Design a protein around this ligand. Structure first.
Ligand code: NA
Ligand code: NA
Lengths: 330, 330
């Protein structure tokens, strides 16, 4: 029922957006169909974990506070699609960076990026035009989107000096994860589920914010290890962090426990496309027992997670229910 | 006094934004300075016509409706910087399209584009946190930004079929100008000057919208002709519309009055980098007396402009004052 509902509201949002273009923005049918396909292609086909989390939070809060039900849930669905569309926007932006007379496909990818983000505003202004929370929703949403762009800057410049391994530390790794991933993937759906459920000021936000960061950290450490050690046809992509000299959990953990000569061997081989240099890096990570340390690190985070939901439940018990479901996904 | 005031508020907005990053988003000094320079580089150095227009409207409405003065004017200044930053955002987006291992400059240009847009939200949420109009301001602003991205799509795809000269018509040329340029360059500063001056529901918006479109059309026709006929060191750039096969005023006007063989000669030579093909196009435009028709066309638009402000003044006389100043710039 959650997914079947989420997908129906998608059709509803899509038809409003495309009818709006045709009726209020003078769009020809050829371009409407082109945008219907681009929307389908960029917004559909993931797991919808961010979007469904809004619904899950919402349903858990109408069970522990008729017509308010179906409206809060519909609101929840539109909120989840705002996050999915924002996610679509970020993935188009990432594609432009690596994909490369006016190049009309790059022009259209830029244009797609702008439209996907504006669509989050358009669907909110329409479907929440009459809700008292529209303005708070907008600001919290805009602020989390800013946070993400700030975290993208931290990430993309982690190996340089904005006009290098000094920023390859664990606290900075956590800064990158917090801003680039945790705020919009974990905190934002939780917060939107509370906004549409009217229950915003009823929760310890500090513990909530703390839990979102920790879950994103757990998720990203596993992600970093799989990028390096899960082979492509099992990972789903070609893992590229070593070539791209990412500030990954493996890299910052290796630097803390490597010998001087090893660090020199790591520094000489990192950030290179050459297959033996990447293999040398994997060899070093292996010999440092990083996949051993991976298990322990996640365990400790899980304990902080498995224990931090309980504070949250002392004053907001239904919230804590969905936060555990979100955590079970991670 | 307007510009001296506009520039002071810039310093005020910049320091809030950069202190916010340092204090609330964990930013290191090296990156703060990097972003201070990027902001300076992208937002400063134009003519500030959009931004000052907000001030001009505001001052004209406190003269025909002490403490409300200096606050409405400050609000006006922040509104003008929102539009200048949005303009900065669009120019970075355009640069990415033509400017072209992870390419860190293209990554940073994408990132710059996102930050410039988020900054318009951040400065509004801060400086207007307590104004009753924040939510209306946001929505009208978001909607005009959507309009612009819709007009960019119209523009970039005017010579193809989104998955060709049929869309080279005058009504479609006006659609492109309306969405891509007029709404954010002419209508948006007028509307924001009214919002901060509380005078929104006091004006005939239809005549206002009609005037903004017409002024943008006037401005863009002149722009199109200069792109083709003003030599570079006098224009400021290398005019490129013929190579880029733009749906320009010259092109759609030439197609209406060319002979069959000429249209074939135009169609064979348009959208090419080769210098003689571009010269052949300029030769055709010349022999069709397009710079003759240019003068008459602008004259007729000017008459529609020079006459449409008067309707507006019958019910909103102070508004009409600034609209004439904006028109005098064009
Ligand atoms: Na998701
Ligand atoms: Na301007």
């Amino acid at each position: 029922m959650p997914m079947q509902m989420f997908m129906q509201v998608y059709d509803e949002i899509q038809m409003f957006l495309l009818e709006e273009l045709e009726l209020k923005f003078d769009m020809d049918p050829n371009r409407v169909r082109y945008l219907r396909k681009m929307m389908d292609t960029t917004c559909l086909g993931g797991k919808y974990n961010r979007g469904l989390t809004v619904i899950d939070v919402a349903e858990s809060l109408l069970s522990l506070s008729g017509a308010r039900r179906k409206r809060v849930l519909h609101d929840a669905c539109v909120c989840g699609w705002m996050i999915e569309f924002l996610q679509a926007h970020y993935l188009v932006e990432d594609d432009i960076m690596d994909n490369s007379h006016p190049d009309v496909t790059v022009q259209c990818a830029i244009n797609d990026g702008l439209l996907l983000k504006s669509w989050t505003h358009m669907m909110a202004m329409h479907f929440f035009a009459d809700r008292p929370f529209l303005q708070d929703l907008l600001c919290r949403f805009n602020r989390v989107d800013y946070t993400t762009a700030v975290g993208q800057l931290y990430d993309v410049t982690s190996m340089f000096d904005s006009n290098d391994f000094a920023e390859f530390t664990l606290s900075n790794y956590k800064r990158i994860v917090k801003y680039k991933t945790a705020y919009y993937t974990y905190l934002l759906p939780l917060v939107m589920g509370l906004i549409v459920s009217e229950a915003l000021p009823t929760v310890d936000m500090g513990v909530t914010e703390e839990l979102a960061m920790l879950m994103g950290e757990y998720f990203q450490v596993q992600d970093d290890v799989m990028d390096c050690f899960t082979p492509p046809e099992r990972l789903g992509k070609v893992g590229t962090d070593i070539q791209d000299a990412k500030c990954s959990w493996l890299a910052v953990t290796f630097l803390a426990k490597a010998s001087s000569a090893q660090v020199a061997e790591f520094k000489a081989n990192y950030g290179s496309g050459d297959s033996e240099k990447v293999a040398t890096v994997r060899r070093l990570y292996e010999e440092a027992d990083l996949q051993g340390d991976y298990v322990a690190y996640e365990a400790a985070v899980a304990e902080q997670v498995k224990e931090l939901i309980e504070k949250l439940r002392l004053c907001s018990p239904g919230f804590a229910a969905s936060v555990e479901t979100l955590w079970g996904k991670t």
